Amino acid sequence: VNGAGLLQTVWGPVCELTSELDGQAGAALKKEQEMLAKINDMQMAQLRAAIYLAKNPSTPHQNALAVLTAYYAERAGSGKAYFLHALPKAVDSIRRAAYLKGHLDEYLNLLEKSSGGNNKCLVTTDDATVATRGGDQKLAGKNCKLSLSPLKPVDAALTYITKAGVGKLRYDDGGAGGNAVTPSKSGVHACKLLIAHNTAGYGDGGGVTADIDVFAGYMKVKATDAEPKLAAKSDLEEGGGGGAEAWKALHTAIKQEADAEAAELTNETGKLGERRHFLAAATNVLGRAAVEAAFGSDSEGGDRKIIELIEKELIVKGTANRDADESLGNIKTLKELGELLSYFQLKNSNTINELRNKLK
């Protein structure tokens, strides 16, 4: 018999999903912050190499330093372009996930609170057992957080919707008299919200004009005397039919998320002669032979020696009006690094003019 509440095998998974959506924005924020940290790491590595070269013009490693500054600049530009390419996709995943969560929280809340006396709209396995909150704020043992927690950059698993599509939900069933999604109405227990018709639902004198999409289209409330009908799995996924656009758009948004470990953001690692962007830098500022001669190595790590020299270079108190000695590898603001490059570039200009005056 029609007219009872919604079985937990249906809404339970929806509760778990909306609870996962709560943390999607914080996970995306964390990924954006980590991407920006890599780009800034490249930009600062460029300046440190440039500072070391300006500080030690007569260094025997000028060719290696010229290659490294040009390489880190390309890495900074390539990382910056990848971030701009990923930014619309990140925004939309935040937008689409929270929009779906708002749909689910509105209707889940309405059903959960439509409880009292005969009214039992979220039930477990039968018409008489209504869901209640436990001390741990679980709803009949399920996570069901129907609001947004404060934004925090921490990862949060999203397992009910992935690049592969939706999972762990019920599909297809209902839409008639089989009591597949609601238990048989055995007596006084009822939930008139789940049918848009007058016999066992909230319709007055008859049904509405046509079935109604709820849960952003995951479920249809019928305009006839019939229990709700669950959408097909493919209706919730990219390429599916109509009726659940918010689900498909979120799947698509998740499919198109950028890779946080993309090659465009990360230092190149191969043998120095195989490193494509090392070679391009050497080609433009000084190919293979030039790279390997500047670093005195064909190995995978022939750059570690000059890299360590840059990091450990001592910047004495008073250099660029600095208040204490520090290692160049620990200076990590653009203001400080830019002032050091300017200080040494100015010194070099005065060295050039003085030597040229002596020679003339």
Place this chain on the structure above:
Amino acid sequence: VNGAGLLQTVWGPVCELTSELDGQAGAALKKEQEMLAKINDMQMAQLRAAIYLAKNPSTPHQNALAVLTAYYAERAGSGKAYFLHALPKAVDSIRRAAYLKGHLDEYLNLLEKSSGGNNKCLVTTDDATVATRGGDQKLAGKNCKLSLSPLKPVDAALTYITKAGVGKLRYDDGGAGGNAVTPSKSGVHACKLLIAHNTAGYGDGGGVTADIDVFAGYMKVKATDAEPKLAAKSDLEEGGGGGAEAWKALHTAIKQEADAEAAELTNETGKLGERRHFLAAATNVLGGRAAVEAAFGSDSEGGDRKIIELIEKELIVKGTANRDADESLGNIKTLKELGELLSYFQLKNSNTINELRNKLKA
């Protein structure tokens, strides 16, 4: 008499608001993109001034170039820090705005589609006139887009919720038998969804346990024989009471939105000797106001315009850093290209220094 649909003076404004929320993400995207563009412009201006000094060691503007490079570096760091501080606020505004829109669209759709025969849940001015979609997809003359448009970085006004709070909605009314939010039920026309009670609503045998927040708390569906109760304006804003957290949290996020033309992102203006970060740059790389005036040869508001124009108009000939064509330095606008030019000329400086020292060797 209780039991009719919802008056358009209530849902009309909610339809207009949810239509505005559709474009919030794109406006936020546009602002972030424009902010990143300013930061990148500072970084590239630093590189051009540094390239010009390296290319022209014998310039008479060496002190001015050292000041500008250090200044543009401070600007790039100051803009980057401002963007990183604004990024959580941007994410939350996107998250909170779309989350509220999802709430409003779910319930609006349910009421709009609960139409047919006696069922009339969104009405205009009386119990018998149900709202319908026109040719332009307006709902009884109102914009009511219950879905998200494709994301576009385009301006989109959000006027119903601002830094000052919410506006243009009805507040306070309802919660009993006065028919302030529903018209009096004259006959067969009905909407049982709007009261969680059995006399004129969808309750079975009695009311539910407690009033129910709908429209994310903008309105309460009553557990007693009573029409819905609209929240007070202050309950929808930062610092308000309970019942509409999704509204207060969106107001807060909007209050904390970043300024796209913030001082931290833009060039300093005015007399050179009064530009705080020009003065700080000069102090640190030269060892204040007097050093700045001497470097640029002026105290006017536009004392830096002469060296800035020299940088922009400097010719970079084909073959410099393996470049394939002549170009003005002010038109070179990638970090790869500018970084290869600075590297090329820094190397030239090293070789110029070594050659001069060997020539001069005693």
